[PDB]
Design a protein around this nucleic acid. Structure first.
Length: 348
RNA sequence: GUCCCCUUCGUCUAGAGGCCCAGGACACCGCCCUUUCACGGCGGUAACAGGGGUUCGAAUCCCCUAGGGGACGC
């Protein structure tokens, strides 16, 4: 009877994730992946602590806890890139890669080819649904908690092999079952790799106003960091990063979480992925997410072409950041998405 | 060198003799929110240019010592 390997972080949703499967009658063993080779004694004092919790649980459930080291697949397939997008002055979402490259590939392939597994599972608050012959990626009760956003690259081929159980409950349940079952500095880090190339801050009306320490240290919409005190203008409202001039190492800023140069009408996504691996052409009426936990925003998606897509919002949106992922949903169905290449600014 | 006006938390500033062991804002620090970077919510630190005077009381009044505007310097 079906053996499913559930990766454990020593978390809680991975824990209750295993117990659920087990309770469903699966030969379920656990796997603890290690994707980074420590550098800080501060780092070890964490993984260690996860491993421990990882193990500690598996005992309580009575399942075998395995171990793999994808620390290299990681470095190459997601850390290289990760850094490379900051070089272009973009703001990448490293986790979208960690899933696509590791969690649902490295682990996926391993668990089957080695750990001899029928299915793979994980602590994602997401739901799977095989309908009309093909598996789909869904939200999972309590949309305020859905994490489908990070698994937009997956493919039915992958969805089918995976098993997302915790997504069928309301998150409150999870955290609880776990108890009733007696169970469970970014700026600095970047510096350990990227050199600071200090430039100068300028306002929307081009006015010397501050420095950088780097341009990889800011993202559109980012408030904290600048260090500005307003004067004969500013309306006192805080300052927000509105643009980044990579070529000129110029950081443009503005004022008012509602300033017109922080708003956009749409965007252009490329590096697309549609869960049903069916290429998109034409036009569609769906909804999008520019950043995690961001509320759904209705839109009109126009099949620009090939792999390029033209998304048209229904109301100007906040900080659309090129380099961030764009996920489209059709109800409970996560359809797919791509990486935001261009922002479509507000008509001047 | 002819005589008019400013000088406060990091920043821009309120105050207008006691309500000021000085307020707001932006910054910053912390916490929370969070499977990315952010946003946001909460909270917190910190200042009256120097010297005198007058007052029971001065940030608040006057007085000179320092730093920024006033159609002669022909």
């Amino acid at each position: 009877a079906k053996k499913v390997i559930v990766g454990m972080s020593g978390g809680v949703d991975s824990s209750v994730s295993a117990w659920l499967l087990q309770q469903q009658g699966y030969q379920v063993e656990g796997l603890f992946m290690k994707n980074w080779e420590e550098d800080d004694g501060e780092e070890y004092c964490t993984a260690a602590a996860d491993l421990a919790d990882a193990q500690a649980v598996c005992d309580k459930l009575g399942i075998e806890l395995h171990t793999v080291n994808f620390a290299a697949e990681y470095w190459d397939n997601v850390f290289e890139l990760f850094l490379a997008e900051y070089k272009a002055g973009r703001t990448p979402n490293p986790d979208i890669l960690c899933n696509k490259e590791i969690k649902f590939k490295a682990f996926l392939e391993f668990a089957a080819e080695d750990l001899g597994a029928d299915y793979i599972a994980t602590g994602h608050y997401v739901r799977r649904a095989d309908v009309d012959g093909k598996s789909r990626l869904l939200r999972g009760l309590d949309s305020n908690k859905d994490q489908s956003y990070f698994l937009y690259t997956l493919s039915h081929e992958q969805i089918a092999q995976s098993l997302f159980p915790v997504g069928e409950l309301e998150k409150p349940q999870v955290r609880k079952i776990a108890e009733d079952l007696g169970l469970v500095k970014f700026r600095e880090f970047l510096g350990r790799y990227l050199p600071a190339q200090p430039g100068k801050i300028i306002t929307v009306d081009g006015d010397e106003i501050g420095e950088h320490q780097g341009l990889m240290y800011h993202t559109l919409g980012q408030r904290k960091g600048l260090g500005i005190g307003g004067t004969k203008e500013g309306t006192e409202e805080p300052w927000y990063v509105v643009d980044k001039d990579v070529e000129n190492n110029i950081l443009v800023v503005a004022q008012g979480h509602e300033h017109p140069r922080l708003m956009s009408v749409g965007l252009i996504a490329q590096q697309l992925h549609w869960v049903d691996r069916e290429p998109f052409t034409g036009t569609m009426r769906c909804t999008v997410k520019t950043r995690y936990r961001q509320t759904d925003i209705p839109c009109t998606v126009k099949a620009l072409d090939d792999d390029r897509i033209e998304v048209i919002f229904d109301e100007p949106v906040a900080a659309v950041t090129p380099g961030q992922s764009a996920v489209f949903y059709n109800g409970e169905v996560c359809l797919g998405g791509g990486i935001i290449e261009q922002r479509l600014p507000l008509p001047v």
